Design a protein around this ligand. Structure first.
Ligand code: NI
Length: 137
């Protein structure tokens, strides 16, 4: 599940870096997928509120809208470098790579949705054990 995300995330980063460095002239900072997963998890709720709920059948134009609301300065590889958003990069792509980028972003937000649900199972199992420990004191 982290496995299919790391494929997507690395695609998303390769595409983003190419455009970001070309357009700004600045050098990307180092990738930390884990740091960026946290950022993505904060972001999913805010995209669902700002635009619409994220379902596996969410339409292209809805994703493309969400790309306006995702700031590269928040992520490891672009930390505080410039004001670029994901749409800023979509807009520099040719019409073929636009479809790939929409697919990659959509599929990445889906894997992040499944990562959120798994994480709140891990915390449920942890509460279930913590409740046992304190129900002796
Ligand atoms: Ni290009």
């Amino acid at each position: 599940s982290m496995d299919k995300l790391r494929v997507l995330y690395d695609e998303f980063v390769t595409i983003s870096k190419d455009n970001l460095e070309r357009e700004t002239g600045l050098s990307a900072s180092d990738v930390d997928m884990d740091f960026d997963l946290n950022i993505f998890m904060t972001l999913v709720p805010v995209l669902e509120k700002k635009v619409c709920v994220i379902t596996p059948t969410i339409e292209d134009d809805k994703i493309v809208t969400m790309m306006k609301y995702c700031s590269y300065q928040s992520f490891s590889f672009w930390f505080l470098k410039s004001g670029a958003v994901v749409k800023s990069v979509y807009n520099k792509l040719d019409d073929v790579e636009k479809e790939k980028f929409v697919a990659t972003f959509r599929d990445m937000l889906l894997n992040v949705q499944t990562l959120i649900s798994l994480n709140s199972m891990y915390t449920r199992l942890r509460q279930d054990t913590e409740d046992i420990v304190s129900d002796s004191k």
